[PDB]
Amino acid sequence: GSRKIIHVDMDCFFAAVEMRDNPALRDIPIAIGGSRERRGVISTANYPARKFGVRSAMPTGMALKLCPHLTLLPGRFDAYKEASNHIREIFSRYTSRIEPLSLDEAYLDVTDSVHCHGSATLIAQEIRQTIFNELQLTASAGVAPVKFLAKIASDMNKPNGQFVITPAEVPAFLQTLPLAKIPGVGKVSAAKLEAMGLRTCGDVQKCDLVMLLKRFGKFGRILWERSQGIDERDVNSERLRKSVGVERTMAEDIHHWSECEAIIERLYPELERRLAKVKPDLLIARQGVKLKFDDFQQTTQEHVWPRLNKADLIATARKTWDERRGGRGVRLVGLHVTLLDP
DNA sequence: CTAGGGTCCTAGGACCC
DNA sequence: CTAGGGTCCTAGGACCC
Numbered sequence A: 001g002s003r004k005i006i007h008v009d010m011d012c013f014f015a016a017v018e019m020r021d022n023p024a025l026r027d028i029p030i031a032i033g034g035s036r037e038r039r040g041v042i043s044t045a046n047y048p049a050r051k052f053g054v055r056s057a058m059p060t061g062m063a064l065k066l067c068p069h070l071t072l073l074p075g076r077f078d079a080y081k082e083a084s085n086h087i088r089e090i091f092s093r094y095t096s097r098i099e100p101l102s103l104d105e106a107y108l109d110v111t112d113s114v115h116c117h118g119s120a121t122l123i124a125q126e127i128r129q130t131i132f133n134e135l136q137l138t139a140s141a142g143v144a145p146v147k148f149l150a151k152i153a154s155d156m157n158k159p160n161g162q163f164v165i166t167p168a169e170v171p172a173f174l175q176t177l178p179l180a181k182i183p184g185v186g187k188v189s190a191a192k193l194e195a196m197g198l199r200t201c202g203d204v205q206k207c208d209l210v211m212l213l214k215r216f217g218k219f220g221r222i223l224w225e226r227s228q229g230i231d232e233r234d235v236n237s238e239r240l241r242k243s244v245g246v247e248r249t250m251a252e253d254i255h256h257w258s259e260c261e262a263i264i265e266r267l268y269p270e271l272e273r274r275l276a277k278v279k280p281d282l283l284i285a286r287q288g289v290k291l292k293f294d295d296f297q298q299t300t301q302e303h304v305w306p307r308l309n310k311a312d313l314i315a316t317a318r319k320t321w322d323e324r325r326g327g328r329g330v331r332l333v334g335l336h337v338t339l340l341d342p
Numbered sequence B, C: 001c002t003a004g005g006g007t008c009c010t011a012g013g014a015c016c017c
């Protein structure tokens, strides 16, 4: 045999950084997100805000109606990136088998670690404590024989705790595990399963695999596997970004093409900078645009293209604007690139 | 009264052999 | 008295943080 997988996850990541750097924000409801005037949402919130119901992805106006004392911060990305680089270097003291999933979390494979006598429990404990020292931030961790259980486990003694699932404990832990707790099983999937009388991993273990393949395709095989603790996904330390985009939601819907082009002119230098970091010569596989309309419908138009090119993005966006807008107002415009393969 | 990044999967149809 | 099957494009969506 069994692997030893750790998932490490920072507690309230953006709000914890802001609370550390400004202690007057410790005991008051705060969130990182865009204002109502800017038609924004909540990136995350601290625990004082959360007991009022403030959640990641909530429209900021709803957040303020739920928590009128909410203090709203714009977010300091360089502060968060600095912390994220530090925790990942901490991870590297313990193993090179590191798969970051976002700024604030990573799977570790410590199957063959000679740290703490190979105890994944003590390694996770030591990683959490080293992060508290040095960074003055708290993390939670999960320890399990496979990825998705380690990720579920990191949520169970959150914040500032951990939870271990041994191979012996997996069958009991699975029997009653709500399917919605499985990463990748979101609102729509969960509801379709519920409509089918499937709520827990116990329910799916009684199910015909062919039946699940019929109704769900590949996802049905994943659901069948995870429901009995099968998850052979290896921790991969060699993943690279495959795309780069820049996009903006305007405070007011635009209705004139010239406004669309003007926004593209503002977006293009930013996309160029970012593509330059990871690909100095700007060579790409595809590039294209995104529009989102006043009804929250959105469309993307992209095409094979060898090199980032502003004039081609504008011409593309003119086509999208002319052919797909349908007379609607546009609330967002975005630019997009997909990188080459090897 | 609904962000901005991204991952991955599926599907319809063009293209290739 | 005409190509199926594979691959490539491409748009859209579920989902993740």
Ligand SMILES: Cc1cn([C@H]2C[C@H](O)[C@@H](COP(=O)(O)OP(=O)(O)OP(=O)(O)O)O2)c(=O)[nH]c1=O
Pocket: A009, A010, A011, A012, A013, A014, A015, A042, A043, A044, A045, A056, A057, A104, A158, A159, C017
């Ligand atoms: C979920 C989510 C997170 N984020 C950002 C803000 C978070 O600080 C960071 C990591 O998100 P999460 O790890 O999902 O949330 P969190 O760490 O803030 O809360 P928890 O302690 O329960 O794990 O990513 C968004 O911008 N939008 C989102 O929808």
Ligand SMILES: [Mg+2]
Pocket: A009, A010, A011, A012, A013, A104, A105
């Ligand atoms: Mg977190």
Ligand SMILES: [Mg+2]
Pocket: A009, A010, A102, A104, A105, C017
């Ligand atoms: Mg996280």
